[PDB]
Design goal:
- Chains A, B, C: Residues 32-305 form the Glycoside hydrolase family domain.
- In chain A, 47% of the residues are buried.
- Chain A contains ten helices and 14 strands.
- In chain A, β11 (196-199), α7 and β12 form a beta-alpha-beta unit.
- Chain A has a single domain, classed as Alpha-Beta Barrel (TIM Barrel), CATH 3.20.20.
- Chain A is of the alpha/beta class.
- The first copy, chain A, has helices spanning 48-53, 59-68, 80-86, 88-105, 133-146, 174-191, 202-205, 239-249, 284-295, 322-335, and strands at residues 23-26, 29-32, 37-38, 41-44, 73-78, 108-113, 116-118, 123-124, 153-157, 161-162, 196-199, 222-224, 259-261, 298-301.
- Chains in contact: A-B, A-C, B-C.
- The A-B interface holds A 47, 50, 53, 79, 81-82, 85, 121-123, 126-128, 132, 166-171, 307-308 and B 1-4, 6, 8, 134, 137-138, 141, 144-145, 183, 186-187, 190-191.
- Bound molecules: a molecule of 4 linked components (BGC-BGC-BGC-BGC) (3 copies), chloride ion (CL) (3 copies) and magnesium ion (MG) (3 copies).
Chain lengths: 336, 336, 336
Amino acid sequence: NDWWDIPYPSQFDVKSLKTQSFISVKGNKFIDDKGKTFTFRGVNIADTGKLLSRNQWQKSLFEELANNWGVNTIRLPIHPVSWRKLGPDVYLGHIDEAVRWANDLGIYLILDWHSIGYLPTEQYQHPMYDTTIKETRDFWRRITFRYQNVPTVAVYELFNEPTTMGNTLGERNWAEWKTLNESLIDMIYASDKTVIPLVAGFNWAYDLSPIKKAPIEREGIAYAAHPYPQKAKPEVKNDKNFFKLWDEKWGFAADTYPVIATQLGWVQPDGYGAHIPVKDDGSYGPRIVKYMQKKGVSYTVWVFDPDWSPTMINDWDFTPSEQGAFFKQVMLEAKK
Amino acid sequence: NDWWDIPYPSQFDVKSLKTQSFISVKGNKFIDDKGKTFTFRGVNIADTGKLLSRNQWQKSLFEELANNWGVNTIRLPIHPVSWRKLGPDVYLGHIDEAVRWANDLGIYLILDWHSIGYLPTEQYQHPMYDTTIKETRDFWRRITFRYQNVPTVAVYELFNEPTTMGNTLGERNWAEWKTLNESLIDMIYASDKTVIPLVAGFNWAYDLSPIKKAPIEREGIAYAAHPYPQKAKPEVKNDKNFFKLWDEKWGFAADTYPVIATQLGWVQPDGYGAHIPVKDDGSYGPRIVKYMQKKGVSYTVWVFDPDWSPTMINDWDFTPSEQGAFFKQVMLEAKK
Amino acid sequence: NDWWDIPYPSQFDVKSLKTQSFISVKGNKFIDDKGKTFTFRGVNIADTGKLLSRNQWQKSLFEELANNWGVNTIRLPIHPVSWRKLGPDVYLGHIDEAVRWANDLGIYLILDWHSIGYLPTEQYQHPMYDTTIKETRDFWRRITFRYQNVPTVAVYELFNEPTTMGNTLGERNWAEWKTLNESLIDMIYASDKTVIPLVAGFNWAYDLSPIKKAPIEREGIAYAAHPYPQKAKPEVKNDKNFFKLWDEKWGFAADTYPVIATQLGWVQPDGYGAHIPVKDDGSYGPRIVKYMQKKGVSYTVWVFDPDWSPTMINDWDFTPSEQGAFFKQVMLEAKK
Ligand SMILES: OC[C@H]1O[C@@H](O[C@H]2[C@H](O)[C@@H](O)[C@H](O[C@H]3[C@H](O)[C@@H](O)[C@H](O[C@@H]4[C@@H](O)[C@H](O)O[C@H](CO)[C@H]4O)O[C@@H]3CO)O[C@@H]2CO)[C@H](O)[C@@H](O)[C@@H]1O
Ligand SMILES: OC[C@H]1O[C@@H](O[C@H]2[C@H](O)[C@@H](O)[C@H](O[C@H]3[C@H](O)[C@@H](O)[C@H](O[C@@H]4[C@@H](O)[C@H](O)O[C@H](CO)[C@H]4O)O[C@@H]3CO)O[C@@H]2CO)[C@H](O)[C@@H](O)[C@@H]1O
Ligand SMILES: OC[C@H]1O[C@@H](O[C@H]2[C@H](O)[C@@H](O)[C@H](O[C@H]3[C@H](O)[C@@H](O)[C@H](O[C@@H]4[C@@H](O)[C@H](O)O[C@H](CO)[C@H]4O)O[C@@H]3CO)O[C@@H]2CO)[C@H](O)[C@@H](O)[C@@H]1O
Ligand SMILES: [Cl-]
Ligand SMILES: [Cl-]
Ligand SMILES: [Cl-]
Ligand SMILES: [Mg+2]
Ligand SMILES: [Mg+2]
Ligand SMILES: [Mg+2]
């Protein structure tokens, strides 16, 4: 009742972590603080609240991924509805757990403010993604204060998937989106300059082409890409044609800035949760991996969860799905 | 609890309706899809929630109006407080009923986002009208998706009565209001181009004069006018002087665009719920009807309800008030 | 349940007050309506809700201050969280009490919308200060309507302490802040032109220097200053060096506009609730009083409360603290 006695917030205790290299941006590459080139390779897990509700928010989950799936990175898709439902204090307390778990395993976290829609008009694809510019700023303000100087938390992915859904949500306007990302980056850098902001384009974070002429005017950032199989639609389906289309919309970015494909994956058109744009016969797997390997692109596969699709696992015993078995071997081999 | 299992929305089933002409804008006229000039002539009823609370939300209400009062149109004043109180899903479910009822009777609906105040500062005449730009956009987003390709729903009246109340609510600024209406129209047209947006001026939707120099830069729209009796204040009260004042503030619009007088009416200064600007000795009735007839102006009288004033009916047996008996005969004669 | 029956608001009954001079702005001075120069000299009390919760919201509080502490002014720091918690109707009802109490004692009130942070991004120092541009406008709309033509309520302090906290809350931008204050002033002046708006600069209302080149372009306003002891940091601590630094950041304003130091005070570095920027050995007391006396600056000391620091009183028997005993004698002597 005494609102005047509500405490000011505290910061994560960095002394509680074991030594872990910071990742930073240098030119078009990530590097660690030993100066070695670094690639994020890993997976999304589900929202923290979804996992808690079925008692699957456990260090054992992180251990499975680190020990058996070859990941060096986990992306946490923090859904605004879940952020509100647990409330900031409880959600941050669970993020703290993820930090300790990842640190102990020597892996890194991408914190993703997981909305879909058009923030400047505050209209979204679905209520679970609902937010405001105010809440979005406040999220990043809180996150940046709490995890200041924490090497485990490497990337702040400002807004998962910008889209206006054919301008039903507003008029897509690069200049206003650019300005807003720059505004968020400024709040972040005022609080912690050691973190990597990740910025996305339109068409559900597929289209980075506006940065050819109007890149975000801030240093030390990276760009997101979500190159699902059906985003590029060549008439003739082969490596060369897909590569050219990917080149044009997002791959070119990797020549100048670091790029993380923070969502990618596929399921068979008749498989579990099959929907546009994730339907593929499986030929996309080797093709996107080859493409990313050639361009030095980082990635986190969607999704290491048995309910949300396309799945990497069919159950909580971690039985691999088609894409799961494929990416697991890719990541194990890369780790070598 | 599982927010991730909350369904995506569905659209009204157009196959459930009987054949009904679409109304569209051509130049300064409405026409039906047989190419014949069309005039909206009808009434407002109360907010859906008010009617539900006294069990008056019934097809019989629509039947009374269509069969005995000669209407071809009903305006639904959706109050934002009621929208929130029933919640979108339940409110839309009742709008669905209105659509089926009106369609069956061969009449049309105007959906009116019924707020009073200044949306750009989000300040209003009364809490019952309280909203935000975000909620207003979301309302129109939901409405346009749900009633796509539904002929019965003819007009989307974006914001009932713009006013700053002597600039106590903000600084009235045509350019910012124009831009915001254009933004809403763009969201709507991205989703359904077969609907007619209705745009209002300041001074409680009385003053359209800014469109002489700066009309909304979008095709297929109409303009609202609320010419209550005491809005124009000639020193000498006659046809000629009122006509000239109406000409100057709103009637001129009918020369170039279609105009719907979506609110109009009167009660005696000593009658039920008498207040500025609806007080009149009754001479306004024939005068506004003559004026509208000469200019081909569409109209929906306020209000076909026994509680809200000025009333068209004194009870739920539909006993006519003074203005009610007057307008009933006007509409019956026009229908012939 | 019947939202349509929710009453429109009413105004404070001015006939309930005894005769009391209006205070107005003339050049760089306040004057009363007898044309005599006037200086606000008094204190802050705690938020109305805090006082109510411990049964300390009583006329006896105002009587103690007027009769024994020599005040002619009390500042009410209305915290947005408390505004929401009591709700506008109940909070305004208690403000009405303060008005009657102050009027009877011949003292004046400053109503302070008591937030800390950056309103244009709606990010704040602490949740208790949380608000929006919409809520802030609505507060001033309600206040200005209710207390129209009430001499007892002299000053509307638009936003207590603007700060971006090292730009962690947003990018401080004088031009956008200026525009927003002008917008609030316009809402206020549209409703009551007899009230004095009080505008603040950045750095927790310490830095008025932007008004040298870009003052608020409205007449009849005053400027706030919060010159706590540790805001100016001269290497050599004496009258001359502090005076020069105060001159440069806020004191210059008093040459052209009226200035009210609506928060000021100190506690010993080892005293109760000691924190930056209010720690001082006590030499600040005579120095700030001398400075303000020379420049004709008005002031309300923070704070006449035994819980909130720095205190003027150590208990509810009004036992004076160090700064309390000091300021009490200053105010008693000035009153003579
Ligand atoms: O968050 C929990 C939820 O996630 C679900 O997956 C999401 C997925 O994360 C998201 O990327 C995906 O977005 C797609 C849209 O749904 C889809 O409409 C859109 O299609 C467009 C077409 O409309 C357009 O014509 O063409 C392009 C290219 O073909 C296409 O993108 O594509 C985007 C992605 O780019 O939405 C998913 C949900 O539908 C999980 O499936 C679910 O289990 C979880 O609850
Ligand atoms: O929504 C449920 C509610 O509706 C009530 O009627 C409303 C009516 O719909 C609305 O148009 C009307 O607005 C008027 C303002 O109330 C009135 O103040 C304003 O007056 C101005 C003057 O202030 C100005 O000086 O001059 C002009 C011209 O004379 C004048 O307009 O006029 C507007 C309309 O233009 O408000 C009504 C409520 O007061 C029902 O009466 C009620 O039963 C329902 O609950
Ligand atoms: O509202 C109830 C609450 O009030 C508490 O006092 C507030 C006080 O009213 C407010 O002015 C004060 O603001 C100070 C900030 O807290 C402080 O961080 C800031 O420091 C900056 C430094 O960060 C900067 O480096 O330098 C400058 C100059 O030295 C300095 O200002 O200073 C501002 C004031 O200018 O915050 C108090 C709370 O911390 C009561 O103490 C409490 O009991 C009540 O509950
Ligand atoms: Cl898009
Ligand atoms: Cl107006
Ligand atoms: Cl500041
Ligand atoms: Mg970090
Ligand atoms: Mg339609
Ligand atoms: Mg006053």
